[model samples]
Target: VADFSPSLWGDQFLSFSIDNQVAEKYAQEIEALKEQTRSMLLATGRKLADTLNLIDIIERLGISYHFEKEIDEILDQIYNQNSNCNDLCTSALQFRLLRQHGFNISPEIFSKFQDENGKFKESLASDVLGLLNLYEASHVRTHADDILEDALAFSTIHLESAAPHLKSPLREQVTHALEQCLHKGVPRVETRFFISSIYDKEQSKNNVLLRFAKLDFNLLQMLHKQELAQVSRWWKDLDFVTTLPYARDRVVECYFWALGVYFEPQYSQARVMLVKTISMISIVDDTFDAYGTVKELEAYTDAIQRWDINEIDRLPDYMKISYKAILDLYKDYEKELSSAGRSHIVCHAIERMKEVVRNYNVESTWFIEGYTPPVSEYLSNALATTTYYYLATTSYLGMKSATEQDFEWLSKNPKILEASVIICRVIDDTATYEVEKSRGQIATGIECCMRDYGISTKEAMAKFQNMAETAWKDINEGLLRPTPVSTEFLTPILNLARIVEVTYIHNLDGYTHPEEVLKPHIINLLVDSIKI
Candidate 1:
């Protein structure tokens, strides 16, 4: 209805590129320091507290990927060690790391902190660091862990009150934890925030780690900047800004979404492919939501079903570009996989996009017919419309170990994947409900809950919010070891949900108003370089 369009930043991002030689020099230095730091931690004088603190810092700084085996070995020893450490801070930190890594650590480890009445000691509130660790640990709660439920409530309340009295870094940590806990927030975003705002330079024990993290962050920022620019060039070629003025030209934000999916240097190709596909999806979503009539969408859906370039001429002016873009993008992926003899994978990827388009068509039907699917019916379609499944499938296309079976399993729609889709769709729906309603859009999860249950918006929101929390439990359950899939394979799936959590944690759609919620994070991650 509105002729609104976002400006492009492709050229600006394209202008960015790190010097390879400088980045190589930094990488060698970082690796040397990593070995040195590891040797120091393994030395005789280091205490358990010292080891725990260092591990926490390294992981929080987003450099843990480089030292996964080392961290795992250390944690294994720590896991097997006897319970000599009685301090709440050490115990809580140890519990969090072990449990976070899928060790069968019990919440009963916190029993000592409880009093005769079986409540956490009131005096422990003063232990800000302990409370913060406990607060983060509580989020790893499974369905049976009532202690963690209570811990979450207790620690959350205490942290909020404690924020004002704490000093720098500690104060900053408390405030940040209260707003967005370490567990549910995106790891990369948290790393960027912590490096600048929370990590204390003077207090740090290992300046090498601090220095390496800065160089690595800046180097990766250059890589991401280059990727964003390349995608921007392609997006600019599409000329969606001028031709499709009603669509949201969010190529930059879409790349941010892809970055959240995989930010490591190794996943550059996957990140680029995912961003390009998602940007097109965003354009198509706008076409369905804001511009396309029912008749036009029907034709477009039929064309996607055909999945042939020859059918492009039958589409309307706007859909011709969108249809051809999606087709060509998948063809590019097909060629990439063809080199590896994984051409069969393209069919699975194509099917996901087709599924998404069909769902979008259904949503357009709902809008045109003024029909409100019940919450159950709405969610069933909303899950597909979320485009997460498309993302999940495409993310695996570029992975070396990912096979046709993995694609088949994803197609079968595993429980955890479904949970992620629910989390994203429900959260996005609830957050954007009113804005969507104002635009005469179709019913969202909240509206469906309100209508089906005959409740007010406030009540419906409360109910759906609880559902979102339950979905998180499902996610935690999915991440447990001995899964049907490998953890490496599932990382993107889990991260996708975390992306949803970070994006819509507040009651606003970050994708829609990019500046409000997403802009600062993008700047911190891709634009601003951390000082060494």
Candidate 2:
């Protein structure tokens, strides 16, 4: 129904290799530097705030993954050091970090900054750094924390006034936080923004950390590049751009999405498998959403449900391509994981994909009929594209960290997973609201809400944004300690929501209009190498 911008990266990632010596030099130095950073983390001044500051930087620099245990030990001390700090920066920083690491810290900590009239102190507005951190911390608030609602508004108002007069990097920090809060940001994208634009510019920047993060990020990019090379090669082999003309050629974007899920080196095979899974589904999404007729989609949904080669006969030529591609992708996952005895995991993954396809078929029916389902009913079918349900299930496909129990846990449509679905679905709707409206596709949840409540579009969108914030709270609550699965499995789901936050900033269709919005980010993360 629409012609998207063609792929910005055509075979660009297909072949690349880092120099043997350059790889060796940084690779080896990272080993020693990693140790020194660990000692430095331990040797920070005894104030918990000092160590908290370092832990915060290590994470922002994207090297905290290297010292999980060391950082965890420090954060364990961080877990209960309440009432220790008196200043706004230190207090809010501690609260933000603790909640982020799933510590379940109380929002009441900020009450000290407020007064008897139930207002944040007027004088506190001058403390720009405090307001910024407070602004960030408010994003982690759960629904029960009504105090944070006030906190968010107060900090936002002051931060806006302060942003102009702020210093260099502080100004950028305020600007970015205003644009996208730290809690909702995709960490890798945030890290790149930090190291390239903010971190090195800081007077407080530590030499060892700056050097370590750069080498570590560049080194990881090599492995990421190598993985993308294979993914790009596999996509070229499919030649889907020609065979299936209507689908967006977003294979590179799909790989970038997978990397957003988990960029750690250990997830290389997992990442490749995820990229392939996302790549194929992207085609199916275009088929159902953009190109297929109601008659064709009805048949396509049946074929997807059965997921059989025999199911392909009734599908049109285009559906046959997508149907076969999906079946083949899952089977490939099955075949590869079979030797490792994790073949059964794909059953859960494939089952979730089936669920998504079924919903897409139903949605297409309502869409063509101009039938606006109940808003609750509309979102229940949120099993479709951009909802994160299928993608979340597929994310763990190749990770050894995943087990049968993990797959079973994922099957339950857990609260955290639902929250992720909310973030992606609502955010995508709001971002693409104008484009989808222009396209005559008026049956979205946003549309349903508008019609049902007799609200204006802006008010309806504002409603959804608030709803998305509630979902973020649900996500924050889910991340607390005593979570059902290990952090390893949960990280993918957390990042899934974060991806939507970054990609859809200010309602930009970053994925659909790559050149206009997402291309520079794609280059920074994938194509361009950071200068040392």
Candidate 3:
């Protein structure tokens, strides 16, 4: 130690480093807590592992085993104690928190601990768990004042830079946690590291927040056996309220979970529309959470009826991102469809999203407050934009791959539309009787049955069925059935038959509608239905 260091401080700086016995004791506490928390969860509710208690337990362990003034010593102590394979996941998550937010965790120290445990498979696995846990926990532990101080104190040559540096990590950590915690796939346009970081996580809270994520992957088998109703029931029962501070956010999550599962054909168009409606509603949701009164959130839905681009500029930066992205998606699709000469069916879908954003002045409401949106909201905006983009892009892919004969077949016969109508009817009827029907029966479609949403019965299905019947007849006859009166150049329609088929077969529900299982033809149908 430098003699000048003590003279400068007057009382002198005390070097705090734990001994071997203390290190072992801390390790035992961490292992004990992991077992204890797991047991508590399996035995009862998640409330058993209170967030504060969890933080307290881990911090205590950190202080006991790693009190060195140097940051490396602090982290080394954590890994050294927690590096066993038996305790990896828990250990890593804990270790990550200690050094989260660009705080450099020394890999060399971790390697040392791994060397001792390398002999046993279980032990080696625990070391791996340490790394995984660090990655995972870094997300949940937000940077508060003390943590920010710890990071600054350890890192900075001058204390002044701490706050701003802290800001960057705060944003990064929050963004990371939002993506990882919700389990959304990184958009194809995003970085691969971003993609891989959250591969196994859920896209929405249903899979992450609830135990239902553990449901057997054999959803196709269950669907084929007509056990979806049972499955739906099981998922519905799995519903638990989120602890997120914002009520609208929780509602938004619940709604998206529904979309991820049931947004297929017969239901596809409706699902698309539903997501748009939710996006529009989210504008108000953003307002209420940030600026609007409760009354405004409840009634902030006027823009859907009108297109007002000027209104978009007024929205919070986050909402503007969503509005602009949706419109851009609409324009891009319109261009692609026109280029391929297949703008018949999809033009309307594009218009639906476009008109919703345009006429409603979605931007105007987006600005009810000048405050910036949360990372979750920003992520949602990015994702909502991408969703529309992909929907249009893939629609073009289906159209481009179709043959002339396929185009002629669409012009001559339209059995697919009839099939869609019938399927909708069956689903609607199923929803009405689902709760009152035979003990074994469950509603077959999402008209009222949203994925990951909790409901006592299929009542929402009945409401949507009525709405769809009214809307479908009008659109099908008014826009689709009648040929244009004047001579005009016509275009091919984007065949959506397989999009629905594949979505139903492979999505959250886990099976094709009638077949009740995953079918090889699902993707082929997507490709086959194309009219190249």
Candidate 4:
């Protein structure tokens, strides 16, 4: 028999190394230049438009994380002042930046641009930059913002029609914005595309800013490559490729998923933790969904719930290995948290994993009994089986700001976390329904909706797709200010949804068979270093 597991990518990144001397030099230069830029921002109090442009460019170019304090200072000052009615572009840009930073700015500001007939004036459509800014701004709308919904439709149609007539950078910007707008896209993906395609073509592009953006992107890529190397080594050490032959060998893709959670250099340790945990999830998912018998799966779930090593001895050989791996991973987590005086974090993390295992057992039971449940019943289990809450909880374990209260708050099933879980389950069902059905798997949301609602498969898919969109509104509402937790804490939760959007967008499941579509993206993001 021929071996059929995908080849490991450990060797490619494992052998790669970054020159710290060069990286440090760039880091020092960036700090000084960033301060220089901040000083200029301070002088732009009378030139608010210029300041807004600076903020816009910094964000679009993908280096806004570097200037959080600086940008926040400027936006606060501008928000306290009246909305600028002088320039359409400036007002629309201000609306976007303010709303993006969690300001409750009214979408009513765009009403001034409309004619008395309540139509956005045709004249405004020809101002491509203003129209584009409005288009971008509309994407951050909440459920109540009907005007912004109209704005989105208006801008999308005009942008598509105007693309051919526009020139150079603006044309490229319009085309790219139509493909994936700022609010919907992952920041790192946006940065990579904008650096070469849009930023370079700007007539007034700042050489220092451009150089720093490139240097910073490449430097961070180096860190990511090194981290992926370490993560790859860890996955290889688990021997899953040889031992767990039924599971998908997606170590590299798992790292990519973790990177989407947080890409800053500071999150290196957290990224490693998430990649390992998510890889474990994939193995466990395959164990129940594809391989394990009902008897074996129930035993495995019981062992995990017991959270005791002694219980592993009662399991079959494969279940023993699976249970042991989970225990060892959590044991290491316990030590890491103990050193930080946060050992209590381990209990919460373990409980989440236990829930994941129990949910998998439920799925296995359904498959075994050949039961096709109602959509509501299926979702109750499917939400847990998605393992997003487990993954989200693990993300905070290594963070300094994370607290016992945060863990407690997360366990209660906050709206934001639930929103992300819905996104994961719905999108995965939509993208993999055909393949899953072919595999003789239990009915996903698509099939369950069809059976429960008496709808066609296409109708069920459209309904589930709408549910995913509505989930995004829940995510947006949860991110608003005067919140339960810090924006710092909320960001990873929000980003988890964004990663789901990228992975399952356009009716594609990049995770299950990533080679064709996700391969080029992985190569662009991880394998190939951006040239300075």
Clashes of each: 0, 0, 35, 0
Candidate 1 vs 3: which has more TM-score: 1
Best by TM-score: 2
List TM-scores for all candidates, in order: 0.95, 0.96, 0.24, 0.95
lDDT of 2 at 153: 88
Provide the overall lDDT of each model, using Cα atoms, as 2-decimal numbers.
0.81, 0.84, 0.32, 0.82
Cα deviation at 280, candidate 4, in Å, is 0.9
Q: With candidate 2 superimposed using the best TM-score fit, by how many Å does residue 404's alpha carbon deviate from the native?
A: 1.3
Error of 1 at 223 (Å): 1.3
Candidate 1's C-alpha runs over 4 A off are 3-5, 8-10, 80-84
* Candidate numbers sorted by lDDT from highest down: 2, 4, 1, 3
**Residues 43-66 of candidate 3: C-alpha lDDT, one tens digit per residue:** 323231142234333232222112
- lDDT of candidate model 1 versus the reference: 0.81
Model 1, residue 238: distance off in Å is 2.4
Candidate 1 is scored at a TM of 0.95
lDDT of 1 by residue, 72-166 (tens): 88888887775558888898898878877766667777888998777899889888878888888887777766666678888889889878877
lDDT of 2 by residue, 1-532 (tens): 4467688777778899778898999999999999999898779457766777888899999999999989877777767655558888888898888877888777777788888877789899899878888898888888767776788889999999879887888899889889888878877788898898898888888989999999999999998898989888889888988888888998888888899999999888888998898888778788888788989998988887787799899998877777887778888999989888988788888887888788888878887887887788888886355647788888888788788898898889899998888888888888777777777778876788899899988998999998888888899888888989988888899999888888887578777777755787788988776777
